Amino acid sequence: LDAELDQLLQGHYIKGYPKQYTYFLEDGKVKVSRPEGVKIIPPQSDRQKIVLQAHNLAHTGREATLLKIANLYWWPNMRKDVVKQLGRCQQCLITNASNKASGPILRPDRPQKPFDKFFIDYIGPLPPSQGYLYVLVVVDGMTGFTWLYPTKAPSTSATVKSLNVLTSIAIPKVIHSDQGAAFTSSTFAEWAKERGIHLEFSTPYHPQSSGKVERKNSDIKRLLTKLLVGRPTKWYDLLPVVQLALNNTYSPVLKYTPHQLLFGIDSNTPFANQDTLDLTREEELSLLQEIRTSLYHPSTPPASSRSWSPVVGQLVQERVARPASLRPRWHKPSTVLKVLNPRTVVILDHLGNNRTVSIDNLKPTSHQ
Amino acid sequence: LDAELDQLLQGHYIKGYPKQYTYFLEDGKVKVSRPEGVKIIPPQSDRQKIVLQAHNLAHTGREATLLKIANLYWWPNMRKDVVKQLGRCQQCLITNASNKASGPILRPDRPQKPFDKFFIDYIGPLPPSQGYLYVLVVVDGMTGFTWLYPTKAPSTSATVKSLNVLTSIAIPKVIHSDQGAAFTSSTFAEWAKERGIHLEFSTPYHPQSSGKVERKNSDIKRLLTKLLVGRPTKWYDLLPVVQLALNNTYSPVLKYTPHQLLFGIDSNTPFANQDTLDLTREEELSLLQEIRTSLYHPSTPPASSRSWSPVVGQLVQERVARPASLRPRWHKPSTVLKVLNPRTVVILDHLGNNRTVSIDNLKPTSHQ
Amino acid sequence: DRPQKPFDKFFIDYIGPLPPSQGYLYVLVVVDGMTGFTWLYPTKAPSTSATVKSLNVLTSIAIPKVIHSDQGAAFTSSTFAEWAKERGIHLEFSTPYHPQSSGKVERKNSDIKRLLTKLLVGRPTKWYDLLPVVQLALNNTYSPVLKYTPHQLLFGIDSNTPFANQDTLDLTREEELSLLQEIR
Amino acid sequence: DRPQKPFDKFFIDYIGPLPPSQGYLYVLVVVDGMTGFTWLYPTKAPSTSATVKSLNVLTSIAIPKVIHSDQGAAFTSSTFAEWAKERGIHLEFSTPYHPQSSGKVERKNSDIKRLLTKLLVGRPTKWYDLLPVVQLALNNTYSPVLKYTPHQLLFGIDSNTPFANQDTLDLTREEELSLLQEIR
DNA sequence: ATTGTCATGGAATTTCGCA
DNA sequence: TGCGAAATTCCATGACAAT
DNA sequence: ATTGTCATGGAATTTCGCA
DNA sequence: TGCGAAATTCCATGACAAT
Lengths: 368, 368, 184, 184
Ligand SMILES: [Zn+2]
Ligand SMILES: [Zn+2]
Fold this sequence. Notes:
The structure is a homotetramer. Chain A has helices at 2-10, 44-58, 62-69, 78-86, 90-95, 156-166, 181-184, 186-193, 211-227, 239-247, 258-263, 281-293; strands at residues 23-26, 29-34, 37-40, 101-102, 117-123, 134-140, 146-151, 174-177, 198-201, 307-308, 315-318, 334-341, 344-348, 354-358, 362-364. Chain A has 368 residues and is α+β, with helices and mostly antiparallel strands.
């Protein structure tokens, strides 16, 4: 601060201060004549206050803050000081957007068998139809085969009623769902343990993780919309038709329908495939097992040019779920405990609870 | 139909029917033994009905429809027939999504002078503050300089009150706004003509077109959010501070603040730039005119690999604005009258009114 | 002739009336002929309407080429005929007083009646809730004649609920009595 | 010494009381010293509070290094002093009974009083709505001494509202009378 | 304690029918 | 042994969302 | 009758201070 | 006439939205 600036004025070299410039005194202030003009050199002990005053005018980032400061001052390594402050402005940290993209998505393996994994979900609310407002959608992971159940609420009770009917057919190893109230209830958990069914949940607020069923929801709504054109939206009576229509629709990339993948043979529906008429059922099942194992599986896409992948002990911020108007979109920083996979992490949230969390809902905290 | 199939059965060549296959009769049906198996060849006169039955099971697209049909039938150029039908399914046309992206955005020239063009807009509603719920935001196109006015409604009356205060300073050639009720009213139109001000409007539902002010809205909310952290959202008293803070903030790409661009000299605010202290005002204005003309202007980005640009007389569909649940997202097809620019067109909408419309709200109608 | 397949033929019949359970009195029984797979639907009556309502659910999942039944009024109605014809389902009837399905189906239907009777007695009114587990049991019961359970034949995989401890469909001396006492 | 600049010095004063117009009685006059640019704010009183309220608006757009005024009570209050000090604005006062701004400012203030008087008479109560156009006029009035209008000097461009037909600030024989009659 | 998906219709690529 | 056209495959585009 | 924008903080590139 | 470090520039990323 005062010491350094003293030595400077006589002309004795200080590391950081270029020797080729004239440092003089004026108005009780140490100054330097730099190419841009004459700047005041504040004592070291004054600099933080300065950086903070400039930054606080509009809570600006690195360059914008520096451009203010450089109007009056010069000192060695100014941006280092600016950045030190940005890294400590709580308001900036929790309000600013990230400018680093998530790492490239995973393409989880398709379940090996029908009934290995169900993805479930509610669509709605829809326009009321016979008192019904929601549709429970159940998608078998391996086959894509889907079951539809109309409900009056996306409740645990309605889920259990519907799934008892479905599991009359077969019992799945795993049911995957989002963190909706109807699936996170202890009652639903009991209903499952009672049956040997493992509940798996998506990370919170990340429907990509329920992509199988979410994507099927699109098709369901799309077909309903078409069938209801120029008629009142009376969808209740169409659910069975839609279910059957979609279960018997080809996926062009697979060259099979979900019905085919589930049974290895078409039922008495229009345009039924006849290519195994001369095989025995056993030969058919054999061919089916072969077809199931050789389906196209997509691969992880390229990372974008500026993505980030999470590291143990890294500082990261979780997105506020439903931020009020004029409130920060980010939680306070928190630490990466475990990296479950390159898209999924456990964090300790300064409370500190352990949360399992998608990186799509995180940003790396800026400025180390 | 019956004629062609007759000639075929004896063995006389028909264009379209490969000569190297055995065409026979069986069960009163013309058949052929193709590599995949034995297929029925329906008479020409039956084919449309067939394509339609298959397509209608689930209103499937080209391959999915074909895969159904090919289970039972073979005939020449099946996909041509499939596509002919898709192009005529009204329900598909207005329900399906597009898979062609808009052409690359325009980067309209920055207005040459302050007051050439204002962009205006309302933010809100916000949490009530002294009875106020909205902010009228006025952004000078050339400078970025912004004016903020708190209002109780995004009304014409409040706009006029605010803008009368603003235009005390200077009168703009043009005010650009979106198609909000407050700016499209005849009263506002009168208020403008009365003053020599040309009203310009964005295409409907396309806030990209008001990007200047929309983007400024982001900064306003972002700074308000920060200043209100851990306090009640009492924003009314902060508007003046925010206005001043943002008007005196550097844009890193320009190396100027909007205040500087408007006046060519800083007022008595923190960290005021002093580099023209020795110029006369006239020399300063001279330098200002130079700086204004040499600002960075962005250029049109590359088109994505599958974009479409509009052509006169092309069939296109406008996006339904606020589609009801289970209703189509697209209007019926319509024709491109004039191509105003590669991102903006006039269409005749089958009513037929003339609408000026952004291509971001159009898709090219599929299957010609 | 081409080998037999699932959905080639569904065999249907009513069981009941049973003691009321949550409002229901009958069970519509559907058995696929090739796999022996069984679906059960509770109804309030052996009516065409109850049959159509129930089969509408089943036929939302798979459609049989042929449905076979006895000459029950529900199955012989012109309404039920209209329904089948709409779905391209051929109806087929055993001659009156001469019911005839197939060995596998007969035996499957035997097991259903016995299994119900066994589980009913003691709680003759709680059967509505037991229908799912009854079906799982029937469908994961190994066929002595084929090498497989209906589940395996229908889906081409093992089940996550193998029923290894295949119990007695026979009644314990106790149940015999408490069932004899119920009918009093 | 360095050349004079906009925002170097604002000159402020009250005009009034005037006939009530939409509740207001006074006009706070702000004139930038270098450009002659003029801002006008309607107030209900020549109070510190009205001054602070009005100047808070102006200082949301630009902040003067110095404000100059007479020794009006509103401007000499310790509250107003606190306000200036908060914004790093130096206050500067003409000595009592000896008002002194500058030639340009004096003349600008002359024009303001005359222009108001002229437009007031005939509608002495409608002045609230005329303030915007009064300001545009004053600010797009060519300065004989400099080669430019305040608009040009402040913004470095021509205006979209040139006021070419610079009328008389002088009163027509009619207005003289109807103004003499108003004060009766 | 977990993880994107897949219909769609132009385009690009491959295969077919015929020499 | 290679051509033109048909068939198939490729794949960007967009939409399902949330607790 | 019209049309995207620009703060942000790592990275890439250039310039600086010194030989 | 070239080095290491600082300064500057580059630019992907995301968020403002609607009538
Ligand atoms: Zn900050
Ligand atoms: Zn269709």
